[PDB]
Structure formats: C-alpha cells, structure tokens
Symmetry: C3
Subunit: 96 residues, 3 copies
C-alpha cells in the first residue's frame, strides 16, 4: 500500500488523469495548491493510493503525461500507507 503524490501543472490534469484511468487506477484526489518557485504558481496536487507493484508504473505514466518542455513541471513523492478502509462497507486493505 503506497501513496503516490504528484504535484503537476493545472492544465495537464486531464491528460494525466485519463492515463491513470487507463492504468487501472480506481481513484485519486486532486487539490489546488501554490508552489515555489523557479512568487507562488498555481498548481495541482494529485493523491493516488495504489498497490506496491504499480507504483513505478503509475509514476512512469504521470511523468510521461506531465512533461512539457520548460522548468516547473512538478514533483512526485511516494509515501507509505499503513491502512486503507472503505466507509460505506468497512472493508480493509486490498478490498478498499
């Protein structure tokens, strides 16, 4: 259980997002943030919780989607997730 967090350029969202649904990723959460700096630029923060096996793959897509041509495209941080539970049912881990 890993959390991939990709801060990217706003307009790239759609492009990236579509790729992710084609990767078999069920869900993600997008927030709007400001980034610094090269003073603060409008950027999107993508949070996707996936299985350990898919991390690199997902990453490889995100970067592929988020690349442009100039400095400031974004960053990607992978963090551990200890537990994931679904609210409607109460399922845990892989079921969620």
């Amino acid at each position: 259980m890993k959390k991939i967090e990709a801060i990217i350029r706003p307009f790239k969202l759609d492009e990236v997002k579509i790729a992710l649904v084609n990767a078999g990723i069920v869900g993600m959460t997008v927030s709007e943030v400001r980034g610094f700096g090269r003073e603060f630029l409008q950027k999107l923060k993508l949070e996707i919780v996936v299985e350990d096996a898919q991390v690199d793959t997902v990453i490889d897509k995100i970067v592929a989607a988020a690349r442009t041509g100039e400095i400031g495209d974004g960053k990607i941080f992978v963090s551990p997730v200890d537990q994931t539970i679904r609210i409607r049912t109460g399922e845990k881990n892989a079921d969620a």
Copy 2:
C-alpha cells in the same frame, strides 16, 4: 503517532466532527479536494487527524460510523505513519502536541 486522512462527503463534516469531540479528539485539519472513485470529479472534504496508535481504530470506527450513508461515494480513510509531531506554540511533542487538558 499515526495520521488519519479521511476523504468524505462535504455535508458530513459536522457530524464527523461531533463524533471526534465525543471520541475525545481535540483538533483536526480540513481541506477542500475533488475526488473520483467507484469531468468525473466530485467536491469532497479531506480531514487530517493525527492521533496515537492506540486511538487509531476507535477513531476510524467513529469516523466510518458518522460519515457512512450506505451509498456509493462515501469516501475512504488512509492511515499513514508520522515520525514526529510537535506543537509550535509550546514545543510539546507526541501525545502532548495533539491533546490539551
């Protein structure tokens, strides 16, 4: 220390909050996000509550109890490790930093 991140339906916020206060949770942090889970993005709330390991499950059980509706889209909860938690005002650490009597 553990970090509970609950993506829930917006209107449920208040209810959840009450549960947490009745759970003895003093504080939390809420941000606005858009989510999709089975264009397709829905307005949802993100609650961030840092608790003690021992308190994790109970808190979860409360959150789920409050944020549940029974319909698809209720949201999810992720527990992640936090290596340090410090209160800025005092300099307190761990349980002291997120509890106040």
Copy 3:
C-alpha cells in the same frame, strides 16, 4: 527522505518563508486549509490556516523544524502544528531524477 508538514497561521507564511530562504531551501508547496482546535472566534467554526509541505533529507529535518518553529510561533493559541512523515521516493518530472537529485540544486 522526510516530509515536513507545517500547518501555520497565514500571515506567518512570508516570515517562515524567509527563514527557509536563509536555510537553503530551494522550493516548497503551500496549500490553504481550514483547521479545528482550541482557538475559535454563532462562533467561528474552522479557521483559515496555511499548510506547508517540504521534502528534505533526514539530516536537514530538525534544523528546518527548528527554523519553522522559530518563525511561526507567537506564544498564543492557534500557532499550528508540525508533522514529519517518511517519504520513500522523490521524483522530478522534467528529467526523471530520483532522491536527493530531484529536490536539491
């Protein structure tokens, strides 16, 4: 790699930022959040707060924390919190750099 997350008072941003610029921090990401604690202000529900996310090497963690605390503290209720969480990987989109290469200049 470690992720320092500092939820602070809005107006303190600049100030903390200055510390970080003096700390040798190249970049950071700030989001706007609502918070709940002891401080309030019907009566104020959730209060406007800033969320800072900085990914650094473990060695730089304490120093940065000590800087942030030095800058964002007031002595009154509502100053905020700081949580450090582990980060297993950090990647730059442009090149594909990993770890220390992706967040340092």
